[PDB]
Design a protein around this ligand. Structure first.
Ligand SMILES: O=C(O)CNC(=O)Cc1ccc(O)c([N+](=O)[O-])c1
Length: 230
């Protein structure tokens, strides 16, 4: 059975304070081999990778964000919170051949180029199939793994799997191992995810995100909203 990754459900801070968020593994201590990543969700479904590899901050992220290990947990510290830091923060831990996302922490702050291009939506019938696309622009598609993530209300982020665009090699989560089909087309720098026999259980926003070994989920697509409805 897959590990459960636990985050505080909600924390409150105020402008100028230092605040720390944590990410616990059900299997034992979080270590550097879990390559802890931190991703920020801002309104309008805007995701940005902040930290990966435990403590490696992504380019362009404000320096007040830092990652460490504390108390057998991964920890994100915001040193001097700003009003715009009010957001949901997800961690992700690597377990040898899959990522697991934590449930997210809603941070309230009281008092306040590279593109991954995804179509906005798919409206499909129950029982139908769909092929979701994610076109990479502004970087070398074959140099990064392409990950896919599902977001449903009350269910956080859920890692589906990833593809190596150089080989088409895939790794899936247990939940998606017999469900998602990932492919790429190299000449058009596009990644695809196919599903069949869809139901309302599949209605969600699906994101692609790039990753480089030891680094971070820096850039995310805007998400395709899949609505499975008669
Ligand atoms: O091996 C290194 O140098 C650093 N390791 C990592 O970054 C973790 C890792 C390994 C393999 C893999 O397929 C993915 N992935 O994201 O799917 C992530």
């Amino acid at each position: 059975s897959q590990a459960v990754v636990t985050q505080e459900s909600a924390l409150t801070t105020s402008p100028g304070e230092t605040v720390t968020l944590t990410c616990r593994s059900s299997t034992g201590a979080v270590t550097t081999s879990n390559y802890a990543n931190w991703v920020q969700e801002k309104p309008d479904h805007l995701f940005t990778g902040l930290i990966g590899g435990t403590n490696n901050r992504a380019p362009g992220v404000p320096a007040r964000f830092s990652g460490s290990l504390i108390g057998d947990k991964a920890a994100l510290t915001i040193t001097g919170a700003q009003t715009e830091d009010e957001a949901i923060y997800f961690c992700a831990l690597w377990y040898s051949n899959h990522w697991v996302f934590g449930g997210g922490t809603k941070l309230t702050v009281l008092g306040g180029q590279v593109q991954l291009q995804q179509p906005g939506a798919e409206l499909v019938k129950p029982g139908a199939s769909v092929k979701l696309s994610c076109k990479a622009s502004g970087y070398t598609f074959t140099s990064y793994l392409m990950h896919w993530v599902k977001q449903r209300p009350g269910r956080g982020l859920e890692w589906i799997g990833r593809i190596d665009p150089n080989s088409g090699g895939t790794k899936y989560s247990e939940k998606f191992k017999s469900k998602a089909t990932l492919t790429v087309d190299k000449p058009s720098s596009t990644a695809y995810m196919q599903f069949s026999s869809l139901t309302s259980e599949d209605s969600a926003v699906y994101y692609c995100a790039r990753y480089y070994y030891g680094a971070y989920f820096d850039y995310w697509g805007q998400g395709t909203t899949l609505t499975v409805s008669s």
